[model samples]
Target: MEMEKEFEQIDKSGSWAAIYQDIRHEASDFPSRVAKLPKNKNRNRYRDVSPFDHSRIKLHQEDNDYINASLIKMEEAQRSYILTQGPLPNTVGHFWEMVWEQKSRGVVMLNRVMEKGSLKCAQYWPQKEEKEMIFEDTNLKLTLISEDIKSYYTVRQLELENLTTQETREILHFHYTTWPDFGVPESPASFLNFLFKVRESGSLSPEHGPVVVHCSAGIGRSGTFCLADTCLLLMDKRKDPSSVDIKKVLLEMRKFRMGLIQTADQLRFSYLAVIEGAKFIM
Candidate 1:
């Protein structure tokens, strides 16, 4: 209750900016070495967005050596995630190339292709009856095997193929359509349900490569999903949800990938979701 009260007070007092800045200060000394690296600079879709050098995802096979992606690994929890931006027109091919290279089995997409008259993301996947979309730049192809659409989310079974080697693998696409671009979900119940759905598919399991999570900028909503998911897992492990430090966990995650829990409201919602999710776990 004390933590809840603190978050409530912060929200009521409009002190989100102060808290955000404080968190930024805590991470000020974090290595920014690669953020300036010319090779990966243009890979970033947004001018203001760049991955922290220490945690940035590197393309081992691609010659361009560019893509806005980060590998966030929580060794203790056995969670490894690829946090990245929505694919741009030019970067869409590189996006698939990263997926192929990482060998990721699932993608947790939180934004829609279009939002409020803006092309928030490229239609990176295949459409109905199209069967497949070949990324000529990366020499990779994505084939749509099936799609299951729910009221709040959609699940698609896709086949990713490597043209060079003629090898293929299956990938699951978990897209949550209800989340607004710059807002939180309606409730934790719905959000957790979607999360468990992804978990049920074993996409979030430690056995698979880091599950790719993204939004438009890959920070705001993506951060929320990862933070809440990690905190709930910690609660389960410690067998005491209240014992977990939400702020500390968020900061630790930020160390792996900067600018998590974008808004003060997001931080507050994360606490709410963690607290509520713990009850179900217990």
Candidate 2:
């Protein structure tokens, strides 16, 4: 996929033009249009091909069934749970061998954002010694966020913001879904659509083990995503289809996950995104 090829070249501050910007592109590759219910007008609005589609085939009904059995089992076995919690702050990405050793260590939590170097640094002025040093010690997944909302990919290039401001500009992208942090709604139809895309796309792969989501101290945005998924799963398991107390559930889940409330601004923002009396995951 040319898009993927483009993703491969992005650096921090996230730019893609140096390598592929000259290439003509089309918006038709993504889903035609994304409709947001008035209830969700205030959340993150960028929409692309659902990241989960390529990785979902690896997920099976039994996984959900096993998780539905108990919260503990649900937490351990469910890919979403592990993927949302993230690695303890500042440890860097772990190798496959290290992952087995770090079981129950919260290493699977995904980092929602980080400040690395830029494509321009790599293309022009690069600190070869520093670049190799970081990659040698800790594997880093590099990315570029272009003005167009397309994600550029890179490898082992962690330059600070000053690396190549000339060639790259700073931008951002949301990890979970079209909605913002914890912006996931309680619509059964919408939830199912989300799950379907996840299974089909490798964006959220369970076999790759868990993904680590983090923001600064590893709360706020990270916590919101985790809590939202937990609630969505709970709604999924309800046989009677009654709405759950998401606030209470999220608070409890946060306490259990890391024993901290890193931030509340996102939670307040979340209130606008999560629907009350919404039990659509039927």
Candidate 3:
């Protein structure tokens, strides 16, 4: 299908709503691995803000201690993403463990430390000019290298080292600070520019391990970012933005990480962002 024709198909009546409804229908009764967590006290604290079973990320560790995190793979686009909840105060060690284990090259954070006077995410990284952030439980050390603040986002250079093995690697921290809880970004222009910046860094490439992405619950805004990037990459690869099916792509993503694209508004914004991003790719 051509880009214009695809746009027409999506722009037809009940377009965004239809997709949103269809996703809801498909999300039913999916398995929940939440019960598999080690029966330790306070385990539930790390669960999603709006806890749902099917989309929860399961860990393979024998003890089952890692918090909510999922690995999403897109073979066609050659992209792998670890969709996870914002690190909780207690899950910081597990978060870094997953980062090291997954060999992720970047961490894309969509929400700020606090949103609307509520704590959204734990301070998982070192301060801008701080010497190092040590996760005592995980024996991991994250050192800050540089910080670049932008109009709506900030990019920081970080080095993650294993205190156990003394192995160190660079990690990019891309933080988008303006996204709202149940809403979209101010505009697709800024969002798309941020997307492209991550793309140019080669963090989304197949060579690196899956990039870790998270917002408040690893669903709404996180899903938006991942969906937009996947669609844009698909369009670029096929040389036809129209051939991409935004709804289908999102449904596929939800299989790996449940509850992606949390609301109807997010679904609507995704279509808008993809359409706007297509302008550049086309």
Candidate 4:
């Protein structure tokens, strides 16, 4: 499905500039220290690169001791598209179309570095300018966020400028976030909190289930979050304490959704995400 073609008036009463001004006024003495998050090595190229060639991808599942063996097919008959090995301006709307094809009413946003340009591209950048480096299309509302503790407050002001839905009078903020920070090391609790909040708000409602998730390249961070969620659900089934088959879950995810955990590091993180979640419960 295409992005809502109709344009509604965006709230400008509480712009980011005003919020920044208020913050500076209040915390003039607050010293800033950079909070570190897990360094994502995936080099993003939304500024430059060509569309990925799906034909080159080996569709067959390769069973290797080192590799997470699985076949990917987006959803049912959808061809598997691996676009994150290198770089690209962005998946553009091609990836959005794939999500739509999955008949997904829920969506997930697990991004890496939140560039200023991505915010603009998602909001007002017209098609002519953002030829390939845009990812704004979605059934659920957009939420641009940061892991920095202070930035969460910054988005609070942005949230005010978020537009209201005519159907439900609900405001749609382009950036959704957690308090104090987004999370350290891709915190599943923080991510889950955000997801649950979105669901409870009747926005991106878990009307069916949890929303679809994807980071850049539609793998890595996105994959880790998904795997953790799946593992957590299984852990709750104490009576059926069976080992969760990671490969089986990954394969099914790719079959229904297009982008998922790619790279060995991301695959490894998927396992870590689960372990971390289990630790939290134990």
Runs in model 3 deviating more than 4 A are 1-18, 34-62
- If scored against the real structure, what TM-score would every candidate get? 0.91, 0.38, 0.87, 0.41
- Each prediction's whole-model lDDT (CA): 0.81, 0.32, 0.78, 0.35
TM-score, prediction 3: 0.87
lDDT of 4 by residue, 1-282 (tens): 111111011123424344323323432121111111122112233322112222212212233111111223333222232222212333233333333333334344445234434541222212221232224432223223222233321111111111223221112222233322232344445554554443454434333322334444444554555555555666666454345555455655544333354444455445555655565666
- Looking at candidate 2, the ten consecutive residues that score lowest on lDDT are 64-73
lDDT tens digits by residue: candidate 1, 1-282: 345667778779988778777887786335656656676665566777777777888777635565777888887677888999998888888888888888789999998999988998899999674767988878998889999999989999999999999999999999999876556765778788888888899888867778999998898889989888887787778755567777777788887776777787777677788767777875
Backbone clash total, candidate 3: 2
List candidate 2 segments past 4 Å from native.
1-90, 93-134, 138-208, 259-265, 276-282
The clash numbers for all candidates, in the given order, read 0, 32, 2, 9
Q: What is the lDDT of residue 51 in candidate 3?
A: 33
lDDT of 1 at 59: 78
Residue-by-residue lDDT tens digits, candidate 3, 1-282:
544555568777657677678888986345554634456335433443333365444444676644667677798998878888888888888888888887789899998898888898888888866567889877889889999999978999999999989999999999987776556766788888998988889888878888899987787888999998888888889854566887788888877766788777788778778878878774
Number of the predicted model whose lDDT against the real structure is largest: 1
How many clashes does the backbone of model 4 have?
9
Across residues 59-98, which tens digit of lDDT does each residue of candidate 2 receive? Answer: 1223221110001113532644332222222222232113
